[PDB]
Curated annotation (Swiss-Prot):
Residues annotated as transmembrane: none
BP terms from Gene Ontology: molybdate ion transport
Gene Ontology molecular-function annotations: metal ion binding; molybdate ion binding; tungstate binding
Name of the protein in question: Molybdate-binding protein ModA
Family: Belongs to the bacterial solute-binding protein ModA family.
Binding site for molybdate: 11, 38, 124, 151, 169
Cellular component GO terms held in the UniProt record: outer membrane-bounded periplasmic space
Keyword field: Metal-binding, Molybdenum, Signal, Transport
Cited CDD domains: PBP2_EcModA
InterPro entries in alphabetical order: ModA (IPR005950), ModA/WtpA (IPR050682)
Amino acid sequence: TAPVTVFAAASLKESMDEAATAYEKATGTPVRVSYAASSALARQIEQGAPADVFLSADLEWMDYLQQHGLVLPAQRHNLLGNTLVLVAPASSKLRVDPRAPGAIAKALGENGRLAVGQTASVPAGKYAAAALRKLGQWDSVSNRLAESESVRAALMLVSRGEAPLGIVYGSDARADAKVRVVATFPDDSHDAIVYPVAALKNSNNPATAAFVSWLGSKPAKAIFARRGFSLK
Ligand code: MOO
């Protein structure tokens, strides 16, 4: 059985791994998930990667594939939501109000860097940059970023204590007890974090639509819900 090839935003690591297993349990169809920043995944797809399903951590990267004709609007829909959080290593005593002018930058200490997804392309980085900008904090940290290849890479920096703070998703924080949530960014500070899922237009996997459809089903949703994603 050709596995359904799912390209999933890095932040979907555990949830999609669980979903892949659960899908195969239910149907006997293996699901092979590849994780990266949604940007990387989208670019890989654009460049011909034979993904069957794409789950992005933002609409923009799905839009990108749509614009490239690789995803049909009919075959995409919003699946999950998240929050954006400021995290610190678990042991960190930092208290930071993202809204307080200069608070994030101060909490970086003398040489600390703010772990973020690469801010141009990685959805978590874009959400982060958007939130930072919106909150007037961007300038204070824009030269103090530890831009990372995905939100999980950013998480890792914080988890490893190599960044005193990072901006990841709420689910990422739940996914790693080695970080703690210092603050949740106001939902008004960034575009809603929405993970669209789409069957790729060119998928030739007979199970692609089934898999995507299945994600609407209670046990599939429950995987994401348990892992701190909001359900769209
Ligand atoms: O595509 Mo991500 O989950 O923002 O690294």
